[PDB]
From a paper:
A promising strategy in cancer immunotherapy is activation of immune signalling pathways through antibodies that target co-stimulatory receptors. hIgG2, one of four human antibody isotypes, is known to deliver strong agonistic activity, and modification of hIgG2 hinge disulfides can influence immune-stimulating activity. Furthermore, we explore structure-guided design of the anti-hCD40 antibody ChiLob7/4 and show that engineering additional disulfides between opposing F(ab’) arms can elicit conformational restriction, concomitant with enhanced agonism. For the most biologically active variant, C232S κC214S, disulfide linkages between C127 and C233 on opposing heavy chains were identified and termed a disulfide cross-over (amino acid numbering follows Kabat nomenclature, κ stands for the κ-light chain). Given this consistency across four different cellular read-outs, we conclude that engineering additional disulfides to link opposing antibody F(ab’) arms results in a compact and rigid antibody molecule with augmented biological activity.
Visual inspection of the crystal structure of the upper hinge aimed to identify areas where opposing heavy chains were close enough to introduce a pair of cysteines that would lead to the formation of a disulfide bond to link F(ab’) arms. The amino acid K228 was deemed to be in a suitable position to target for mutation to cysteine, based on distance measurements. MODELER32 was used to generate a predicted structure of ChiLob7/4 hIgG2 C232S κC214S (cross-over), with the additional K228C mutation, to determine whether a disulfide bond between the amino acid 228 on opposing heavy chains would be likely to form. With the assumption that the original hinge disulfide cross-over is maintained, the C232S + K228C κC214S variant was named cross-over + K228C. As seen with the parental cross-over variant, the cross-over + K228C variant showed two species migrating at ~23 kDa and ~104 kDa, indicating dissociation of the light chains from the heavy chain dimer. X-ray crystal structures were determined from pepsin-digested F(ab’)2 fragments. Anomalous electron density confirmed that the structure-guided design process was successful, with disulfides forming as intended. In the cross-over + K228C variant, the disulfide cross-over between C127 and C233 formed in addition to a C228-C228 disulfide on opposing heavy chains. The designed variants are slightly more compact with hinge angles of 125.3° for the cross-over + K228C and 124.9° for the cross-over + T222C κE123C, compared to a hinge angle of 126.6° for the parent. Flow cytometric analysis showed that HLA-DR, CD23, and CD86 upregulation were significantly greater for the cross-over + K228C and the cross-over + T222C κE123C compared to the parent cross-over, as was B cell proliferation, measured as an increase in 3H-thymidine incorporation.
Author numbering:
A (entry chain D), D (entry chain B): 232 to 444
B (entry chain C): 1 to 99, 108 to 138, 142 to 196, 198 to 225
C (entry chain A): 1 to 228
């Protein structure tokens, strides 16, 4: 099979910048190359066919060039809705093969997260488990540190994070962190706190509640 | 408009078979070849094979020759792909396409697992105390398989909504949170999350009550 | 122990008939006479009639001669009463009873069933909605906190309400239903506790409406946390 | 038919007092008279047969006497669990006939109600109706006045009360009052108050909340 490589897997650029995505083949494919866009939604659309030809509805800021083993997709001025993964595909020989893809995200100004903490419901708690949720809303960049404290004791190995895809409009991320405890363990302790470190914060923000008492 | 409508998500057991359908419209079915593509979670696209609807001739990627069987029904403009001898490695999204691959279906999620279906529990996320925005949500916990859909107020509330990607817990069940941020002053507004887990035929409406004392 | 187990509550339409059963145990069915009694809501007891299970002989209050028919099934130790040509005036609780004989001819109704509620109405069955009554601590100097469940818009009677699957009984007040102008019933069930907060205890009301086959568990959120 | 009369329909006495309940017949019944006890829950038990004989399990503080047309049931020292309705029944002639019954309640010391107000849930409110509940807990005597005020305007004809039977332990009553409004009407006004008058209160107690906050 013909190996298709996209040497850059991850890429970020500012709004209005010119972006170029690389695609290389293990042998000459004689311009038989297409480009696809996949949104975070999972929906796929054709951008370019036969190296340089535009598909219906594709704006002219998208263009493609290359020959032999090496090809390029260019986005002349980056709009927010260009957030996607871009895939090349050869049809020189069967089987058709795709590149590993290049994920494109936007550089914006730094934005501090709004932080919220949520105690477990009694409805959950009566069944023997407690989920405590810390929410970081609409921040940039993605890098963020969440630390759980229970009576000021740092927790480890009992939380999981989930992060949204970059928003198509404001180009921010949101993050949830869930601390899971037994009912018994939950009812030993009093103060529940998530501490957030992020670039947009001058110093770490703590949100906390006390479990009654 | 050209359109390819694929069948819904499916949980199936290892060693068994599954059949995915692709209902076309907006063009003459018999005039275009149909190709199928695989995408494993977090991975690239793989060409499975193609079928010529008019006669029924097929060509397969050698990697899928003992895996996939493609058929068509000309009377209903529908293409089918059957995957046999299923393993966990066959868990993926599968796309039908029209031949470049100029139009794509929305994808079908196949989960291969011997584990049973389980509907979610839905708990409220309400803050403890009574800024320009407050936050609330629903925790959708302990379901299998993917996916769940979450809406707010029967779809009338979309502004400020973040439904996080599910994470697989160590229990082997999925969990996610859906949160809303809304104007801090909310007095006249109620907030109800609508959770649908089709695999288990579960529909849950949970109104999130404020802790206002 | 002597026991008379009556059939569950029944909604039936005017002009129709209904059959109530009375399943006995703890004694020999054919050795004791059985009597039936009517009690309208807020009213006194009325004798309907009696039946001799061994042969099936009956005597009726003349007021119920065009109303009631009593039978027995000896194989299942069960007495039956059928009420025909139903009207709203037949809406009542009906009791089966055992008659004991003492001297020559001293008679009394020594054991009673728990009663069967018959509602005669053209209206349809409707299951309740269950809403929380959420505890707000109004002052710091509160010696008791209170929460509950509102069980609204059901028909017919009755509903049963328990707390924490029956494990919580102290401090519970389940009020009598009131008929709303809509023709549907509503009641509240409340719990009060000595204000030591609530402890590690949660509060779930269990609502059962047999006529509609509705069972609802509703956890009432305490909201016993604060950020500050 | 023989008319059986219990001239006293309602009776209250202190714990430890001696209570006598009367039963008269429209003609002589020659001692063919039984007594029954009905608890608030609706369960019925035989107390006395043939004027004076005790049924199994009936404590000896119960006794019965009489002849001809006039009969008496006596409770020698009143316990709290004697709260019930008592019925006489003749079997001199068919049909068997019962007296109208005598309800027995306990005299205790005056006890002020604890008052609580509950706003409507959002879960109810979204469906277009608002129920506001005022609770009066564990008071004596039964007589009590609840007035609803909405922005200090006395409400009329839009509430319903319910009162528990006397508690078998502490001999108190409780009362609920429900004010019912449309969602629209509810959302016109701000301050919701129930005002309680009772003998154990030095002056009327008002509990209130403001809607929104």
């Amino acid at each position: 099979d013909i190996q298709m490589t996209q040497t850059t897997s991850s890429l970020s650029a500012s709004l209005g910048d010119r972006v170029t995505i690389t695609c290389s083949a293990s042998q000459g494919i004689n311009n038989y190359l297409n480009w696809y866009q996949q949104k975070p939604d999972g929906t796929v659309k054709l951008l370019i066919y036969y190296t340089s030809s535009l598909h219906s509805g594709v704006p002219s800021r998208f263009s493609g060039s290359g020959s032999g083993t090496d090809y390029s997709l260019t986005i002349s001025n980056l709009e927010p809705e260009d957030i996607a993964t871009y895939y090349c595909q050869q049809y020189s020989n069967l089987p058709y093969t795709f590149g590993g893809g290049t994920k494109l995200e936007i550089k914006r100004t730094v934005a501090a997260p709004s932080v919220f903490i949520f105690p477990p419901s009694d409805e959950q708690l009566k069944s023997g488990t407690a989920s405590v949720v810390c929410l970081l809303n609409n921040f940039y960049p993605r890098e963020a540190k969440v630390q759980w404290k229970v009576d000021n004791a740092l927790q480890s190995g009992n939380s999981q994070e989930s992060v949204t895809e970059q928003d198509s409009k404001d180009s921010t991320y949101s993050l949830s962190s869930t601390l899971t405890l037994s009912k018994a363990d939950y009812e030993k302790h009093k103060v529940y706190a998530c501490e957030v470190t992020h670039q947009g914060l001058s110093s770490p923000v703590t949100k906390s509640f006390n479990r009654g008492e | 408009e050209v359109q390819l409508q694929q069948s819904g998500p499916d949980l199936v057991k290892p060693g068994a078979s599954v059949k995915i359908s692709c209902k076309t419209s907006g063009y003459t079915f018999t005039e275009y070849i149909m190709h199928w593509v695989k995408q494993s979670h977090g991975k690239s696209l793989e060409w499975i094979g193609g079928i010529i609807p008019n006669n029924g001739g097929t060509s397969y990627n050698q990697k899928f020759k003992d895996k996939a069987t493609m058929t068509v029904d000309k009377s209903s403009s529908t293409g089918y792909m059957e995957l046999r001898s299923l393993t966990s490695e066959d868990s993926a999204v599968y796309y039908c396409t029209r031949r470049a691959l100029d139009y794509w279906g929305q994808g079908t999620l196949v989960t291969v697992s011997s584990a049973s279906t389980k509907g979610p529990s839905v708990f409220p996320l309400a803050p403890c105390s009574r800024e320009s925005t407050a936050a609330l949500g629903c925790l959708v916990k302990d379901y299998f398989p993917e996916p769940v859909t979450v809406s707010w107020n029967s779809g009338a509330l979309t502004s400020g909504v973040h439904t996080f990607p599910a994470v697989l817990q160590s229990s082997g069940l999925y969990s996610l949170s859906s949160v809303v941020t809304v104007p801090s002053s909310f007095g006249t507004q109620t907030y109800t999350c609508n959770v649908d887990h089709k695999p288990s035929n579960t529909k849950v409406d949970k109104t999130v009550e404020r802790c206002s004392c």
